[PDB]
């Protein structure tokens, strides 16, 4: 090939040449420049005014190779900064790419899919603009086959990824009707046997569940929660991670939505998740637990029955600090919403000492959360007339020293809560 390492000047010469073949060779040279790993000259290409030419080449049905080369060039320009993506959009690329989705050449339609994914991936405004130009119907039409396995793997992964970008970002979240239009295909992809397709489908679902309970309900109504729990159990970390994100999102919802997560058998996976060697998995699992323990007393009871309280004690005792903070939250929610018997059980599992140990942390918020938890537990103790036993318990593991020291803490609610605790139970 004689299209390797052209100067931008030569590329411009060729593209301006009145010869379709010359334009093709120059466009390919541009593509090869724009696809080098080391500092591709995107800004130089833009400054040379080439984008409108590329876009015009997208429409040359009579010359599919120049459609492909220009599609790839524009794809890589749109992969850059918001400004570079914007240069591509401003060139008129969106309807051109959408028109290319119908191309009889798989590599060309695929490249169009990819490009639209980059443009939509820039953010809410471009995402919504891609949708207004009508991308969703032809995109989905590309998946209208009896069995997804007959499609090329790379092709399918690219499509799934671009759809996931149409589901991504907030303020605003995607249009409700767009979400409803995309969701069934997402469900189908969520049952496809490829790890990357599964990962990206899961990520899409996680985007869609990241919002108000109505948004969550749109997803939950499609019946995907059991599949999410199954994927939650997968060996591949790139699958588990978005599965767990989606599940956590869903349990930020209503008691009924959360209950749907529990009924699908999610809790059975949390012994592993709460001890997972990957820090973010442990953190997000504990976050998820914290929103489940903020639930109803029967839901708290299901957490108890699945033997998960000792795992919460474990995470509180030793974990990455952020995970520990999530655990503190889980405990404060548990003690706020739990029965006296459930709180007693919590104490019997050994929550007090690690709770106290975290009072030496340099984080005001977790101090507040923990003090709140201690307050709730003391309330249970009062209800049982066992406040003295709890006071002794806290004193013996050195909790009293820490609480006494929190009196001199600078934050108001902290020394107020701690002084209250001291004056009420440790006199």
């Amino acid at each position: 090939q004689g299209t390797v390492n052209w100067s931008v000047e030569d590329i411009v010469k060729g593209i301006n040449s009145n010869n379709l073949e010359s334009q093709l060779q120059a466009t390919q040279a541009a593509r090869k420049l724009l696809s080098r790993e080391k500092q591709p000259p995107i800004d130089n290409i833009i400054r040379a005014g080439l984008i409108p030419k590329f876009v015009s080449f997208l429409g040359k049905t009579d010359c599919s190779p120049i459609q492909f080369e220009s599609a790839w060039a524009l794809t890589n320009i749109a992969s850059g900064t918001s400004e570079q993506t914007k240069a591509v959009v401003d060139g008129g690329a969106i309807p051109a790419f959408i028109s290319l989705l119908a191309s009889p050449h798989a590599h060309i339609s695929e490249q169009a899919v990819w490009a639209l994914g980059n443009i939509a991936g820039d953010g809410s405004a471009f995402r919504d603009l891609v949708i207004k130009h009508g991308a969703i119907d032809p995109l989905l039409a590309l998946l209208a086959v009896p069995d997804l396995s007959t499609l090329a793997c790379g092709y399918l992964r690219n499509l799934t990824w671009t759809l996931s970008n149409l589901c991504r970002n907030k303020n605003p979240a995607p249009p409700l009707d767009a979400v409803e239009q995309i969701l069934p295909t997402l469900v189908r992809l969520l049952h496809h046997n490829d790890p990357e397709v599964l990962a990206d489908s899961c990520w899409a679902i996680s985007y869609l569940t990241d919002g108000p309970n109505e948004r969550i309900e749109m997803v939950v109504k499609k019946g995907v929660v059991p599949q999410l729990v199954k994927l939650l159990g997968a060996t591949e970390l790139p699958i588990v991670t978005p599965a767990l994100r989606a599940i956590g999102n869903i349990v930020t919802g209503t008691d009924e939505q959360t209950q749907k997560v529990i009924d699908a058998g999610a809790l059975a996976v949390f012994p592993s998740l709460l001890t997972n060697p990957k820090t973010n998995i442990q953190k997000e699992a504990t976050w998820t637990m914290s929103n489940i323990t903020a639930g109803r007393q029967d839901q708290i009871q299901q957490v108890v029955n699945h033997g998960l309280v000792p795992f919460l004690v474990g995470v509180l005792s030793k974990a990455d600090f952020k995970t520990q903070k999530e655990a503190a939250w889980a405990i404060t929610n548990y003690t706020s919403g739990g029965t006296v018997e459930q709180i007693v059980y919590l104490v019997h599992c050994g929550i007090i000492e690690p709770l106290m140990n975290l009072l030496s942390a340099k984080d005001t918020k977790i101090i507040q959360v923990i003090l709140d938890a201690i307050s709730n537990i003391f309330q249970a103790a009062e209800k049982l007339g066992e406040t003295e036993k709890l006071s002794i318990m806290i004193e013996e593991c050195g909790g009293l020293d820490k609480i006494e020291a929190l009196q001199r803490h600078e934050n108001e609610s902290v020394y107020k809560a701690s002084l209250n605790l001291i004056e009420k139970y440790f006199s």
Partner: peptide
């Protein structure tokens, strides 16, 4: 982080 990239660059094959 571990999420899919927002944009993807198609590199030399």
């Amino acid at each position: 982080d571990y999420m899919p990239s927002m944009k993807r660059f198609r590199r030399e094959e």
